[PDB]
């Protein structure tokens, strides 16, 4: 888990940090639906796993930025845990 | 297939188990469309492969949980079968 549990730690952070900067960046932009922590966390899980249904997504510049930060740190968190959870 | 067929076994379980806890968790939440086994299984395949169209998705807390369980056990089932079906 020096690689496995290691990624999880980083990930569950971004998730939380993401959901937060998400509602933070999103409120204010009329129409944004990414404006409440609870779901904002569901969005992040979607995003980080790349499933993205579209039920919720970012609509502001920095919003999109966090988003990009979540996707990236997630598409790899899951990556390292991949050559592990299966190795 | 000690790694290949091995993952398939685990996966086709989650799929079934998922679809089930899905309709189970979803019904009750007014508006949820993830309320019937048949499709609920299609949703799971979408989800587990990360395609997620959005035609159907979870809208309840535990619903989302199962979802997270399906994505994870799927993003890896497909992972191990990857360094196999191509190795």
């Amino acid at each position, epitope marked *: 888990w020096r690689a496995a549990g290691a990624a999880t730690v980083l990930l569950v952070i971004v998730l939380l940090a993401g959901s937060y900067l998400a509602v*933070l960046a999103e*409120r204010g932009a*009329p129409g*944004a639906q990414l*404006i409440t*922590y*609870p779901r904002a966390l569901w969005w992040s899980v979607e995003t980080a796993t790349t499933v993205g249904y579209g039920d919720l997504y970012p609509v502001t510049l920095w919003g999109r930025c966090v988003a990009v930060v979540v996707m990236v740190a997630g598409i790899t968190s899951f990556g390292l845990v991949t050559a592990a959870l299966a190795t | 297939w000690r790694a290949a067929g091995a993952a398939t076994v685990l996966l086709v379980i989650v799929l079934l188990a998922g679809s089930y806890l899905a309709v189970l968790a979803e019904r009750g939440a*007014p*508006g949820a469309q993830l309320i019937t086994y048949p499709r609920a299984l299609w949703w799971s395949v979408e989800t587990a492969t990360t395609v997620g169209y959005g035609d159907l998705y979870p809208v309840t807390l535990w619903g989302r949980c199962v979802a997270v369980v399906v994505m994870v056990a799927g993003i890896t089932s497909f992972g191990l079968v990857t360094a196999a079906l191509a190795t």
Partner: antibody
Amino acid sequence: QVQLQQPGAELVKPGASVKLSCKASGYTFTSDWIHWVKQRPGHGLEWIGEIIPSYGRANYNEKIQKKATLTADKSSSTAFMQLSSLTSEDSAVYYCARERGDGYFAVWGAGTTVTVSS
Amino acid sequence: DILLTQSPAILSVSPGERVSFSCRASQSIGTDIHWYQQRTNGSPRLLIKYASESISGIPSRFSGSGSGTDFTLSINSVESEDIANYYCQQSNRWPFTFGSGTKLEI
């Protein structure tokens, strides 16, 4: 105990400004947002704006002329709403309310009656 | 921004009778609707959250239903203490908005 404490009233001469306060107690989280709502006599509730104390950012209702400026003091757990250049149209009860970042106003202050008159 | 329509503005009911307040959203907002009660000279008080979730401290008499664009706040067997103005509020999209309110008359 009273979660949100607001002063009972404020008299303001036309053209002048006033700073309303809202002292909060009880549990406080980094995800709390403090909202302000305006209600004229005999009329409904109008959302003015919100602020997140943990970060200090504020958002405002775009549909109405901006009369308010929101700030918050973390050490004293107090949120403030500066209303400037008021007219009789600004006379009303101004409530502060707390939202735990989950969409609903769990609790409201008693409200501050602001009267704009000479 | 989401417009919340509450009609009729006044609802007259006889004692002990069931009453239903209406709230219609200009677009679909799932179940992101909350109801508040405001008595004469009082501050608003949360009654129901997310369309149908109970709030501790509120009489079982109060219940909510609906999803999408149409919502209902119901009171089983109205009594004097229920006389007040009732408002709906949405949190599906920014900015949060309030309905114009319905007064309960007995």
